[PDB]
Design a protein around this ligand. Structure first.
Ligand SMILES: *[C@@H]1O[C@H](CO)[C@@H](O)[C@H](O)[C@H]1NC(C)=O
Ligand SMILES: *[C@@H]1O[C@H](CO)[C@@H](O)[C@H](O)[C@H]1NC(C)=O
Lengths: 189, 177, 13
């Protein structure tokens, strides 16, 4: 099918700062991927983002009833929906499972790669650190970055390039808002 | 701190519409337009909150009418296909005979139309697979997840096959133990 | 706790 496609998108956005203290609402309309008109609660009326949206800005701004409906959205819509799901969204805390296993940088060489798999945590903010004999190793660290599993859990791999010597102890240390003290897992050669 | 987005789209000539709520990049729920039902991303969500799906269907009707209006304004300028980037991964470290899940992450594409197939040893797999709706991005492209629970074994190889109008050939992303 | 949908607005014709 080579027929041309045409796409309309709308995004109603609620931005929260310090809980529901400061809230900002954006009513955004899109043609394909181009935003053409938006309502910013900081401004109080619609503004054309491109020339394609000027007829909507003028027309919608002439409807005083619609405008005050949008100007109250930070209360009637943003703050309301925040309170509806706060218990299982804002306060959702899942602690990660931390696995450590070796790998190879070259398929025939020796194990020169320590993988710290950090799986199933929420929210995404996390800090992973590598240590060798109680000393933090900041060189040779590669990661996948933060990976979103799409099911309200995150994961990440933090890998340390090193040549393990016998007797060395490596520990991967994880900090996450669901923990009250760092989570450490050791690996011995 | 936090961002909640009510994202909607309507697509011609496919006549596909969608409606969903996003929290910090995760889906809270979407509305099945056919069943006119609220579909919670996690079953727990449906026990603490509710949503009447009729409000979603009314918005989709307006978006349909607006799209015809905006198509005229643009002088019928169609969308440009943006092919996706596909990643295959497991949600936990892989152990033999220990059940796991394969995740196919399809990212940064538009329009939101895609044909996704799981393949085990080159053959299509349908048992136990699941998927998400099209998820919104801040650059206003889309992303999507497909899942395949599986028992890891050295006897099997897997591929996620993704076809998109922005791709010449189907995109195959491989995985093996 | 019921979620509220922010209504779409019909464009100018
Ligand atoms: C569509 O064509 C008309 C007539 O030339 C022109 O005035 C208008 O600016 C065009 N709009 C776009 C988006 O190309
Ligand atoms: C998906 O496959 C169907 C046929 O099964 C085809 O009509 C359609 O164009 C395909 N869509 C994409 C995006 O490749």
């Amino acid at each position: 099918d080579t027929r041309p496609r045409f796409l309309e998108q709308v995004k109603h956005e609620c931005h929260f700062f310090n809980g529901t203290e400061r809230v900002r609402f954006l009513d955004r309309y899109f043609y394909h991927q181009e935003e053409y008109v938006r309502f910013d609660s900081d401004v109080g009326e619609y503004r054309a983002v491109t020339e394609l949206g000027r007829p909507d800005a003028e027309y919608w701004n002439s409807q005083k009833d619609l405008l005050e409906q949008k100007r109250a959205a930070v209360d009637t819509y943003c703050r309301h929906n925040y309170g509806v799901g706060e218990s299982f969204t804002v306060q959702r805390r899942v602690y990660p499972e931390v696995t450590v296993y070796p790998a190879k940088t070259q398929p025939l060489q020796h194990h020169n790669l320590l993988v710290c798999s950090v799986n199933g945590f929420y929210p995404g903010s996390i800090e992973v650190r590598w240590f060798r004999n109680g000393q933090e190793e900041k060189t040779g660290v590669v990661s996948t970055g933060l990976i979103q599993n799409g099911d309200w859990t995150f994961q990440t791999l933090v890998m340390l390039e090193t040549v393990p010597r016998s007797g060395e102890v490596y520990t991967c240390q994880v900090e996450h808002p669901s923990l009250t003290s760092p989570l450490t897992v050791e690996w011995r050669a | 701190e936090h961002v909640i987005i009510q994202a909607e789209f309507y697509l011609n000539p496919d006549q596909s519409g969608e409606f969903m709520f996003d929290f910090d990049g995760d889906e809270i729920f979407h509305v099945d337009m056919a069943k006119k039902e609220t579909v919670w991303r996690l079953e727990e969500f449906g026990r603490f909150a509710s949503f009447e799906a009729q409000g979603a269907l009314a918005n989709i009707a307006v978006d349909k009418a607006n799209l015809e209006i905006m198509t005229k304004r643009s002088n019928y300028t169609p969308i440009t296909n943006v092919p996706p980037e596909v990643t295959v991964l497991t949600n936990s470290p892989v152990e033999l005979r220990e059940p796991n899940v394969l995740i196919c992450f399809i990212d940064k594409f538009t329009p939101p139309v895609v044909n996704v197939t799981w393949l085990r040893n080159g053959k299509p797999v349908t048992t136990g697979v699941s998927e998400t709706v099209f998820l919104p991005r801040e650059d206003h492209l889309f992303r999507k997840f497909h899942y395949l629970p599986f028992l890891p074994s050295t006897e099997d190889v897997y591929d996620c096959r993704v076809e998109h109008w922005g791709l010449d050939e189907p995109l195959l992303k491989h995985w093996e133990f | 706790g019921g979620y509220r949908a922010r209504p779409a607005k019909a464009a100018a014709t």
